[PDB]
Every structure is written in C-alpha cells, then in structure tokens.
C-alpha cells in the first residue's frame, strides 16, 4: 500500500552527521567518548547483527493507601557477536512496555570489548586480554583468560553476555549474593566494559590526535539547517 | 603568548589599575596560589597581572579556534555580568545566556532551549555552578573568571580577576572581546579600538 | 584484623586451626562421638524392629491431617 | 616499628601513582630498594630517579610516568624452586603477556623471565604489573 | 596490538590523557579535547595550524585540568617560560 | 467569595496584551468589547473575567515593566539604556592612583608613573 518511509528526523548534532553518511562507524563515536542519545545511531551501523535476549521480568511493588501497586522490571541484554554488547533495564506498568523500552536503553548503552590472546598469537583473538574485576551491589565478578577451545566456564547468566560479546573462552569466579540477577548482570557488564580501559604495554606508543567530527563537519552543520 | 606584539602595553595597565582588577578577596585557594603576588598589610590578596594577561591570551586562542562562531555559548547569571555578555554577543558571533539557566539546557533532547555548544565561557564559577556541572556531562571545555577564592572544578582556563562586582567584570569581558577580534584579524593591532569599555559596565542606580 | 604472617609461625597457625574447627557444628558431631552414642540406630542406614502399636499424629499448621505412624 | 623497608617504598610509590603525581619521595632507602627500582626502570615502568645523600639512610626521588599499574611485596620472602615458579607467576600476574616477578638469587636481583634464562631460583621479593 | 603475522587486531585505539597518561575509555563524558590556536608571530594573527590537548575526566573533576593545560602550554611556544 | 483568577484567565489576559496593547485602554467596558472582537471566548462569564484582568494588568503596566509581558514600546527604552547611559562621554579614566605593594608588583612588570602611596594603619582589621 503506502511506502517511502521517512522517519527519524534527527534531533542532535550527531544525528545529522550520522544520518548523512558523513561518519563511518562507531569507532569514531567511541574514539572521542561521545554520548549517544538516539536509539537509531546504533541501528545504523548495526542492526544486521544485533540480538535481544530477555534475562528476567521481576515484579516489584510499592504499598499504597488502599492497595499494593505493582510494576515490572525487565532486564534485556543485547549485542552482536563480534565485539559489542549492552544491557538495559526499565520498569513499567505492563510487561510489554518494559520490554519495548529496555531494548532502547540496551541499544543506547553499547560498549566495545577488547579481546586478546592467551598464549600465542595465531590470529583472531579469543579471550579477555588480562584479569578483569567488576562490582555492583555486593556482587563481585572476576574474568580470567583461558586457552583456546575451553569454552566459557560460568554461571548461566554471565554465559549469556560473555557469549554475546564475542568471547569464546574465559574462566570466571563470583562472590557474595549472586542470586540477585540485577547486580550479577551489571557486575558482569562492568567487568567487560573495563577491558578497553586497562593500560597494557602495547598501548604505550604516544597518541596522535586526529580532529573530531564536530570540527571536521563544522561546514555541513553550519550550512544546511540548525 | 611569548612575543612582543602580544605583550601588555602601559595603557592597559592603567585600565586595569582604574577598574581595580588586581584587587582580590580576603580568602584563598590552594589552586589559585600561583596567580597571587603577595598579601597586603590589611587582609587582602593581590593578583599578578602578567599571569592575568597570559591566561587571557590563552582563552582568546581557545575561542579563535572554533570555526562557526555561534557555539561559544556565553553564560552569566549575576547582574554585574549580564550587560557585559550581551555586548560580547554583539562583538563576536557568540550566543548569550543572561539570567536563570533552567537546568538541563545542555542535556535534554526535548527541551525547547536545548543547545549543544563546543565551548563555554562563564563568569564567577561559584555562582554558575549549574552550567559547569552540566558541562561535565557532554565533554564541554570551560573558561572562567575566578578570584582569590573560587573553587576550580570543571574549569580549564582560569582567568584571575576581581569580578566581585565592579568595573572589572566589564573591563575583562571587553578586553577579551578585543583580543579575539584582533588575533582573528577583524580589527588591526595598535590602532585603538573605537569601542569604549563603558558599553560593558553595569547600571548602578542611574540618576 | 591480624593473622600471623611470619616465616616460622606454623605451630601457631596449625594449633589455632585445630582449635577453631571445634566451633563448626557439622565437624563437631562427627568427632565428639556423643552423637553416634546417642543415635537411635547403631550409626547404620537401617534397623529392624517390632511394631508395638499404631498411632496417628496431627500435622503442624497451617495444613491439616492425621499422619498414620507405627511405633517400633 | 618499620620492620620492612621495601614494603613502605613500594606502597609509597603505589599510593601516589594512583593519585596522579609526577614525582615521589621515598625514605629510608637501601641497596635492595635501589636494585629493585633499577629492574623496574630497565623495562620502562618508571623514569630515571635520583638518590639524596644525608649521612644517614638517604632518600630517593622517583619520576613516574603513567605506565605503572601496580607494584607490591610478598611479605615473608618465601623460597621458589623453578619448578614451583609457574604456580607463582600464575597466581600473582594478570596475564602471561606482561608483568614481572622480581626475586633475589645468587646471581643478583632479577626478574623471573631471566631467572629461567640462567637456571636458578631463590627468594621472592615482590611483583609489578 | 599485533599477532604472529603483524596485522593489527583491534576495534580501535583509545587516546591517553596528556596530563596523566591514562587511556580515556568511551563512556567518560568529562574528558575533553581542547584545541588551541597558533599565531603568525610577526603580525599576531591566527594562521591555520593549532595544537590539540586531551585531558582525562578524573583529573578534570579533581580541579587539576587548569594547571595541566598551563604546563602543556608552557611546554611549547604558547607561553615560552618567564610566566 | 474567592476571587482568585484561574490560570486560564491569567494566560489569555497575558497573550492579549502582548498582541493588542494599543487598543486596551484603561476602562473596563471598552476592553470588554475589544476582547470580544479580537479573540474567541466561548462564554460571557469567561469573557468578562478575562477583560477584567486585562484592566488590572493595564493599570500596572502604566508604571514599570511586568515580568510576563514583553511589549514593543517598552523594550526600546531598555535597549536605549543598554546601548548607552546619560553619565559620561569620557571613559571612567585611566588617571587613577594607588598605594604600596603594588608599586613593587609593577616594579617587576615595569611601570613608572601616575601613582601615590600611603602605608596603611599598622595591624590587620579590627
Ligand atoms: Mg539466598
Ligand atoms: Mg527474592
Ligand atoms: Mg562459643
Ligand atoms: Mg542445631
Ligand atoms: Mg557448617
Ligand atoms: Mg512452614
């Protein structure tokens, strides 16, 4: 019937440089640590590879004068299988609104993961590059490198984010109240996010500052429209 | 800046001494300690003016490096600043914000005042804490006119000056508007600018 | 907040652990022997007996029944 | 009352790298600390350093770059036997591609990747990664 | 970050703070990328080139981006000592 | 009684004055007709209350400016006072003179004229 979709008129200086192809891929949106605020930028460079996996639907409820008003908290992980992942949380009055709304957050929070080698470099890194630790609430999670072919060794929950981040082999440990799925998943996501901010003897070469896209595309943004 | 054509000339020294920008407060920071020269024999500190000049030309070089002039948002909330920043928007193409700031102006894609600058000049870091702690969310450099006692946190180029409410606030903004225009090449150096600083001073009770 | 770490402290460590094991209930009843002496079996898995009589015991609330037991 | 002088030196350097400083003062000092800092410098984890005479134990000023991540001491100097060395560099080190165990041997104060080369074990001092 | 063939295997290469030398991960919305103009030294006018500086988030929120930028400017022809 | 006008009466009366300021005089029965002509108020009772707040606002605006209404004729008198003030054709001058500890601050910046001196009463404030 009707066709010729037009939606997503951007609302940001980044939405303009991304909708028009003037920006290549996330690796320059990350290089300047810019904040993504639209749920479509990720759907642009990805989408052909992203998967959504609901982890839990938890009914919480507050006490009210006459009654106990209950809402649902839906934990949704997301990620391709080549080095990106994200995990979002949203609470709402009905179970569909929460699941629809959490996917937008989990997209809006995708981070890059850095996979390294265990013993010798035979192409295509496979496990974490070093020993990483991450906390939330009382939960602590520790991720350790492992030799090729061992497969992830963890509880069922972290063996859903570690797989969707693209890490094949990994050894793990956890401490305190792992039962609470909230803290157990934010702890894992944190220990993954820490992978690119661990300085290693290979990242010692002095850095060469290029120019940010807010400077290189200052013309296209001046002209065209505010 | 190191050369001669950028060194402080003896008439600017007399403007500075007339506005009293060298006069500081009674307190201090452990961060503004390198800008002080000494403390007077009644309890007040004195600001080294050559350091003022060097920090001024550093901020000028930070503003000049922005291609579109229209994203150098200039904020000021207190009265003694408002009139000044409005003239700055006239001098160079910047964008003024004088008055209350309405939290969330930088970080809310829904508000009608949502503007995304690339720099941020601001008077008085202690009375404009809100724009600072909101610049801390979107990678926004900062420039500010501090004092002997102004907390340095989320500011980058601190131009020491009185700014306690004086002719000194207007004088500082005017001199900063002169040096941006000069080194961008829109007016010529060592021909005195036709504008007069008093266009930037505040309305004390009129007449 | 303090545990001897030095290079010749092994006597203290061992003699202190050997003591603190006795506060662990599950270890204590394996080794005091007063449990095995008091066990109504012999410390075996099963035992033969002769049925003295048949009783019913009322279950603990909330749920309710009469539970049909022998006394041996 | 200051039983272990290397422990203070390494904790002092470490409490200051995290803060972001550019120079640190260590006091007292010793032949052992000076040898240890040399091992930490031949590999590039700190910059050059300067020793102050004062007719007592001296003091050291060290120039830090940001490359350092942790350094620490193993408090009883346990013995290690080149067949129990792996069980140490697999417990203390973060990954088999960087980091060093520093130990004292009859052939001087060295790092395990060299003790393996000269075929000798000895007493463990610390680690840095 | 290479392997036994040489070809780099990395999503990207983060940039380090110029005052603390700690890499700037891609969720640090306080790290800034200051960009300071050159002048032509004879007329006192801006001319193309400029010098870029990176400053971490943690040293920015401990009140030290100021003196850091100052030393980084003094280290070059932007202040030339004698301050 | 009450007589506390609702926010739907205090917003009409604010837009109307901005758009039509030169009609809205100072009596009520003429405003009650102007307001009926310009806007569409779907009641008599509401029309009168709107036209009755308009008169209050008009009486107030024939004094200083009110902080909800930006009228053209009263912007320019502020625009004037920002463009320049009746006080001076000179700057507030460079010819101003100061006291010690600043002569030595300039002695290390090289100034040599137009100053004064007075070593202040000899202990900190009291
Ligand atoms: Mg439990
Ligand atoms: Mg529960
Ligand atoms: Mg007891
Ligand atoms: Mg019991
Ligand atoms: Mg037990
Ligand atoms: Mg029960």
Swiss-Prot record, chain B:
The keyword tRNA-binding does not apply. This is Small ribosomal subunit protein uS2. One of its GO terms (biological process) is translation. Residues 52-111 are annotated as: Interaction with PPP1R16B. The chain holds residues 3 to 209 of 295 of the full protein. Belongs to the universal ribosomal protein uS2 family. There is a cross-link at residue 87 (Glycyl lysine isopeptide (Lys-Gly) (interchain with G-Cter in SUMO2)). Required for the assembly and/or stability of the 40S ribosomal subunit. Required for the processing of the 20S rRNA-precursor to mature 18S rRNA in a late step of the maturation of 40S ribosomal subunits. Also functions as a cell surface receptor for laminin. Plays a role in cell adhesion to the basement membrane and in the consequent activation of signaling transduction pathways. May play a role in cell fate determination and tissue morphogenesis. Also acts as a receptor for several other ligands, including the pathogenic prion protein, viruses, and bacteria.
Curated annotation (Swiss-Prot), chain C:
This is Small ribosomal subunit protein uS12. Keywords: Acetylation, Cytoplasm, Endoplasmic reticulum, Hydroxylation, Isopeptide bond, Nucleus, Ribonucleoprotein, Ribosomal protein, Ubl conjugation. Belongs to the universal ribosomal protein uS12 family. There is a cross-link at residue 37 (Glycyl lysine isopeptide (Lys-Gly) (interchain with G-Cter in SUMO2)). Residues 1-26 are annotated as: Disordered. It comes from Oryctolagus cuniculus (Rabbit). Component of the ribosome, a large ribonucleoprotein complex responsible for the synthesis of proteins in the cell. The small ribosomal subunit (SSU) binds messenger RNAs (mRNAs) and translates the encoded message by selecting cognate aminoacyl-transfer RNA (tRNA) molecules. The large subunit (LSU) contains the ribosomal catalytic site termed the peptidyl transferase center (PTC), which catalyzes the formation of peptide bonds, thereby polymerizing the amino acids delivered by tRNAs into a polypeptide chain. The modification N6-succinyllysine is found at residue 54. The modification 3-hydroxyproline is found at residue 62. Its main location: cytoplasm. GO terms for cellular component: cytosolic ribosome; nucleolus; rough endoplasmic reticulum; small ribosomal subunit. GO terms for biological process: translation. Component of the 40S small ribosomal subunit. Part of the small subunit (SSU) processome, composed of more than 70 proteins and the RNA chaperone small nucleolar RNA (snoRNA) U3. Residues 1-20 have a biased composition (Basic residues). Hydroxylation at Pro-62 affects translation termination efficiency. GO terms for molecular function: structural constituent of ribosome. It is found in: Cytoplasm, Cytosol; Cytoplasm; Rough endoplasmic reticulum; Nucleus, Nucleolus.
Curated annotation (Swiss-Prot), chain D:
Component of the small ribosomal subunit. Part of the small subunit (SSU) processome, first precursor of the small eukaryotic ribosomal subunit. During the assembly of the SSU processome in the nucleolus, many ribosome biogenesis factors, an RNA chaperone and ribosomal proteins associate with the nascent pre-rRNA and work in concert to generate RNA folding, modifications, rearrangements and cleavage as well as targeted degradation of pre-ribosomal RNA by the RNA exosome. Required for proper erythropoiesis. It comes from Oryctolagus cuniculus (Rabbit). The keyword Cytoplasm applies. Disulfide bonds: none annotated. GO terms for cellular component: cytosolic ribosome; nucleolus; ribonucleoprotein complex. It is found in: Cytoplasm; Nucleus, Nucleolus. Keywords: Cytoplasm, Nucleus, Ribonucleoprotein, Ribosomal protein. This is Small ribosomal subunit protein uS8. The gene is RPS15A. It comes from the Eukaryota. Belongs to the universal ribosomal protein uS8 family. GO terms for biological process: translation. Pfam families: Ribosomal_S8. Component of the 40S ribosomal subunit. Part of the small subunit (SSU) processome, composed of more than 70 proteins and the RNA chaperone small nucleolar RNA (snoRNA) U3. GO terms for molecular function: structural constituent of ribosome. The modification N6-succinyllysine is found at residue 87. PANTHER family: 40S RIBOSOMAL PROTEIN S15A.
Swiss-Prot record, chain F:
The modification N6-succinyllysine is found at residue 19. This is Small ribosomal subunit protein eS17. Its main location: cytoplasm. Coiled coil: none annotated. The lineage of its organism: Eukaryota, Metazoa, Chordata, Craniata, Vertebrata. The gene is RPS17. One of its GO terms (biological process) is translation. Keywords: Cytoplasm, Isopeptide bond, Nucleus, Phosphoprotein, Ribonucleoprotein, Ribosomal protein, Ubl conjugation. Pfam families: Ribosomal_S17e. SUPFAM superfamilies: Rps17e-like. It comes from Oryctolagus cuniculus (Rabbit). There is a cross-link at residue 103 (Glycyl lysine isopeptide (Lys-Gly) (interchain with G-Cter in SUMO1)).
């Amino acid at each position: 019937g009707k066709a010729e979709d037009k939606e997503w008129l951007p609302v940001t200086k980044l939405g303009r440089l991304v909708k028009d192809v003037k920006i290549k891929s996330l690796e320059e949106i990350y290089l300047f640590s810019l904040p993504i605020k639209e749920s479509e930028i990720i759907d642009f460079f990805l989408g052909a590879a992203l998967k959504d996996e609901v982890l839990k639907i938890m009914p919480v409820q507050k006490q009210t004068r006459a009654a106990q008003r209950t809402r649902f908290k839906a934990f949704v992980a997301i990620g391709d299988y080549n080095g990106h992942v994200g995990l979002g949380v949203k609470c709402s009055k009905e179970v569909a609104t929460a699941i629809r709304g959490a996917i937008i957050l989990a997209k809006l929070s995708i981070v890059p993961v850095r996979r390294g080698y265990w013993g010798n470099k035979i192409g295509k890194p496979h496990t974490v590059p070093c020993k990483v630790t991450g906390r939330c609430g009382s939960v602590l999670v520790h991720l350790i490198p492992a030799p090729r072919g061992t497969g992830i060794v963890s509880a069922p929950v972290p063996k859903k984010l570690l797989l969707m981040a693209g890490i094949d082999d990994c050894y793990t440990s956890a401490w305190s109240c792992t039962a609470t799925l909230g803290n157990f998943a934010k702890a894992t996501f944190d220990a993954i996010s820490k992978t690119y901010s661990y300085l290693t003897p290979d990242l010692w070469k002095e850095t060469v500052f290029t120019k940010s896209p807010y400077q290189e595309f200052t013309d296209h943004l001046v002209k065209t429209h505010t | 800046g190191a050369l001669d054509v950028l060194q402080m000339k003896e008439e600017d020294v007399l403007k500075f001494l007339a506005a009293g920008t060298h006069l500081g407060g009674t307190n201090l920071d452990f961060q503004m300690e390198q800008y002080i020269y000494k403390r007077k024999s009644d309890g007040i500190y004195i600001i080294n003016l050559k350091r003022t000049w060097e920090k001024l030309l550093l901020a000028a070089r930070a503003i000049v490096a922005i291609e579109n002039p229209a994203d150098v948002s200039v904020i000021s909330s207190r009265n003694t600043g408002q009139r000044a920043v409005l003239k700055f928007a006239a001098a160079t193409g910047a964008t003024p914000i004088a008055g209350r700031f309405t939290p969330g102006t930088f970080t809310n894609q829904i508000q009608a005042a949502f503007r995304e600058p690339r720099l941020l000049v601001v008077t008085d870091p202690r009375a404009d804490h809100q724009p600072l702690t909101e610049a801390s969310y979107v990678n926004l450099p900062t420039i500010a006119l501090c004092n002997t006692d102004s907390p340095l946190r989320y500011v980058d180029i601190a131009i020491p000056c009185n700014n306690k409410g004086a002719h000194s606030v207007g004088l500082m903004w005017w001199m900063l508007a002169r040096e941006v225009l000069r080194m961008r090449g829109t007016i010529s150096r060592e021909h005195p600018w036709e504008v007069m600083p008093d266009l930037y001073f505040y309305r004390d009770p009129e007449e | 907040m303090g545990k001897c770490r030095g290079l010749r402290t092994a006597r203290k460590l061992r003699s202190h652990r050997r003591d603190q094991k006795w506060h662990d209930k599950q270890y204590k009843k394996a080794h005091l022997g007063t449990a095995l002496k008091a066990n109504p079996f012999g410390g075996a898995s099963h035992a033969k007996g002769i049925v003295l009589e048949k009783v019913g015991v009322e279950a603990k609330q909330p749920n309710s029944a009469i539970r049909k037991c022998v006394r041996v | 009352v200051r039983m272990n002088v290397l422990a203070d030196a390494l904790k002092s350097i470490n409490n200051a790298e995290k803060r972001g400083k550019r120079q640190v003062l260590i006091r007292p000092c010793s032949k052992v600390i000076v040898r240890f800092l040399t091992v930490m410098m031949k590999h590039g984890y700190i910059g050059e350093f300067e020793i102050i005479d004062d007719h007592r134990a001296g003091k050291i000023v060290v120039n830090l770059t940001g490359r350092l991540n942790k350094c620490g001491v193993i408090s009883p100097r346990f013995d290690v036997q080149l067949k129990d060395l792996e069980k140490w560099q697999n417990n203390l080190l973060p990954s088999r591609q960087f980091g060093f165990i520093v130990l004292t041997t009859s052939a001087g104060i060295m790092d395990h990747e060299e003790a393996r080369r000269k075929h000798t074990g000895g007493k463990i001092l610390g680690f840095f990664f | 970050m290479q392997n036994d063939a040489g070809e780099f295997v990395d999503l990207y290469v983060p940039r380090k703070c110029s005052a603390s030398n700690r890499i700037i991960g891609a969720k640090d919305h306080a790290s800034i990328q200051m960009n300071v103009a050159e002048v032509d030294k004879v007329t006192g006018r801006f001319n193309g080139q400029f010098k870029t500086y990176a400053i971490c988030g943690a040293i920015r929120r401990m009140g030290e981006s100021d003196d850091s930028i100052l030393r980084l400017a003094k280290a070059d022809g932007i202040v030339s000592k004698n301050f | 009684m009450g007589r506390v006008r609702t926010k739907t009466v205090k917003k009409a009366a604010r837009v109307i004055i901005e758009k039509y300021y030169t009609r809205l005089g100072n009596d009520f029965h003429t405003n009650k007709r102007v307001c009926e002509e310009i806007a569409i108020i779907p009641s008599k009772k509401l029309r009168n209350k709107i036209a009755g707040y308009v008169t209050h606002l008009m009486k107030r605006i024939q004094r200083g400016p009110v902080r909800g209404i930006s009228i053209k004729l009263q912007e320019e008198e502020r625009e004037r006072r920002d463009n320049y003030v009746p006080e001076v054709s000179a700057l507030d001058q460079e010819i101003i003179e100061v006291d010690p500890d600043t002569k030595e601050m300039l002695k290390l910046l090289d100034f040599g004229s137009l100053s004064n001196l007075q070593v202040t009463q000899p202990t900190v404030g009291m």
